[PDB]
Design a protein around this ligand. Structure first.
Ligand SMILES: Nc1ncnc2[nH]cnc12
Ligand SMILES: Nc1ncnc2[nH]cnc12
Ligand SMILES: Nc1ncnc2[nH]cnc12
Lengths: 273, 273, 273
């Protein structure tokens, strides 16, 4: 009850005394995307293992650092690597960083991920602006409500900020970067989906599928952080070849290759919001 | 397992020592609806925190009392307020009162709740007779079966008693209270749905969405209790205005507003079952 | 992370001392299909209670024996009965034997089950080759990956081996046994589905529904085990009579009736792999 609040405060104290403290935007760097850290200038690198009550990062392609610094001439806090429910963690553990971000004075959260394309018009390499999601992981707010952070029953009507989507599209046009928009479906994993599951999710309004994001987005919105999301389509959950197989490394490679274009958007978006 | 039997009997023994005992019908008053307890004459009020093994009603707009008395000239046991999975309770705790009712001799259970309308003909203020449900919460029966209560694989072909539905429609017709009929979809919450979730659930057959009712209905049916169920449509999960937000007090005020019409149907229905 | 490896090794070592160790194919016999054990000759029966770390079979119609011997002229190992999530076992518990089978040198898993039909052409007593599934149970791979068995993110594009399906098809034709083909939807249970739920899964591409099998397959696929799946349709989740109920004993009856034909396919199939 009082112990939980105190844990947030302890993690936030620790970061505050190591970070500048002027950043209003945090960025979550997903599976193929951790090397966008290279674009952050004047880096203060804080390993998750050093931070009170942060989980200890086990997913492949997830380094596990808080990075303080400058992106698009703008103070930033990045999560290099993110936690996932498939790792064994509770939702409380997965989303812990988002509430620590609130305590640091973060107002905007940009979130990226590697996602499977289930809209048959999305192809490997495409960047998708997340316009909405479907949650199929346990809701992260289950349990007693942390009133310090928000209301018992938060609105999810526009989880993905309309102004941010508008500005990101404007920016993509400026930069000659094509973007898609659509609905991200959040599933636990960690196995990739069967064709039947892919077809199911596409049939009910899914455009892309992955294993993160939604929980942190629900927790962000619960505490009034404005959210922008961007998937990299790293594989196509349709048109299967007779001997096709999804692969951890092919997803990471495909995200790696789209990192520079997504990074460019994030760099100008951070200065725009 | 006899430990759990011990628990049920202790709660039943306690309640039976305070209640008249002649009630054959129990009612559950949901978010709208604690006001219906004013319509019960000769009340005997039993705080949940006095009853052995009863969980505590932490949900806002849920008082947490058993209330025996007379409704429409008929003996009743009411649950003024209820338990929800989003609270952090186990399904066992959420549904414990249902099994206690059984041991008290309750044969019928009228469930009411607040619900979002997902079919576009369902408007704020509408009363919707639940004629079926789709479960998206953990099933309350996972675990060793409690043989004292029911079979291992209970049937759920007509969970919402047809006879009670037919009577209610008649009673509605007599009282000139227009009623809708449709499928209730139960999610965990506690965050309201996204438009993509609302749309998904409407696509597959849902008419209204709530965070309750399904677990209790399953357990009631597991133990042969006949179920009538009605939602108040408190908000419309479709045709979203650009700045629309879902809200807890908005739902409660909508439920309150509709209370009386629901109350009138329940009082005549209890008298005719 | 290190303790669990040992548990798998203790179980396999216990089984390896009692079995002759040349079986390459294992078979799971589900509800009402335990009788198929009669086909197996030179049986060595090893009750689950004896094997280190095996859970207890608690589902009616599930004896809980590992049986070694000869079926179809071929060494086999059979799980006579299986575990289910609805029993309250963790997915680690439910799927533990599959990993134990891998350590025994099992290369091929033949999974059977009883299932409700949601395809309207699928009638009581029909045999349905599973060509894909939709998982609606907790993913059994959640938590730290066991690297000694498989990769963090294993592929489920062809969970049900295509050559095994072709062979089953040809065999069924030879034996003059009508077969069906379709997508099995895995649900937790234990309560049977509502008409609304049967309709949902039907709409989204499910052909049959049950409470098993999907965890074992994910777990088998994770460790490279080639899988063949067959359902017996033991009920029709459609066109419900006014007074129809599902019934555990009815389901067991139907599977019984269909044992002989499933076993005749299994016996030919095991010798053809
Ligand atoms: N197809 C897919 N489904 C779920 N998560 C993923 N992460 C990368 N590709 C994915
Ligand atoms: N739209 C909605 N979703 C879930 N629970 C509710 N309770 C009232 N309205 C609701
Ligand atoms: N209709 C049904 N639903 C779930 N599991 C089953 N097993 C056999 N019939 C079933």
């Amino acid at each position: 009850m009082k112990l939980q609040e105190q844990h947030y405060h302890e993690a936030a104290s620790f970061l505050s005394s190591r970070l500048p403290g002027d950043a209003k935007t945090a960025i979550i760097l997903g599976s193929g995307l951790g090397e966008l850290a290279e674009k952050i200038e004047n880096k203060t690198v804080i390993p998750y293992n050093e931070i009170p009550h942060f989980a200890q990062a086990t997913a492949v392609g997830h380094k596990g650092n808080i990075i303080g610094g400058i992106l698009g001439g703008t103070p930033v806090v990045a999560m290099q690597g993110r936690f996932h429910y498939y790792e064994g963690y509770s939702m409380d553990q997965v989303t812990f960083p988002i509430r620590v971000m609130k305590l640091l004075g973060i107002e905007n959260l940009f979130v990226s991920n590697a996602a499977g394309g289930i809209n048959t018009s999305f192809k490997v390499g495409d960047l998708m602006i997340i316009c909405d999601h479907i949650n199929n992981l346990p809701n992260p707010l289950i349990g007693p409500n942390m009133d310090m952070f928000g209301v018992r029953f938060p609105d999810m009507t526009r989880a993905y900020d309309r102004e941010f989507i508008a500005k990101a599209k404007g920016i993509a046009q400026e930069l000659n970067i094509p973007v898609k928009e659509g609905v991200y479906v959040g599933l636990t994993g960690p196995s990739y989906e069967t064709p039947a599951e892919y077809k199911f999710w596409g049939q009910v309004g899914g455009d892309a599928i992955g294993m993160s994001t939604v929980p942190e987005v629900i927790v962000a919105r619960h505490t009034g952080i404005r959210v922008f999301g961007m998937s990299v389509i790293t594989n196509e959950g349709y048109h299967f070849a007779d001997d096709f197989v999804n692969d951890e490394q092919d997803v990471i490679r495909a995200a790696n290759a789209a990192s520079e274009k997504m990074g460019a958007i994030f760099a100008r978006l951070i200065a725009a919001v």
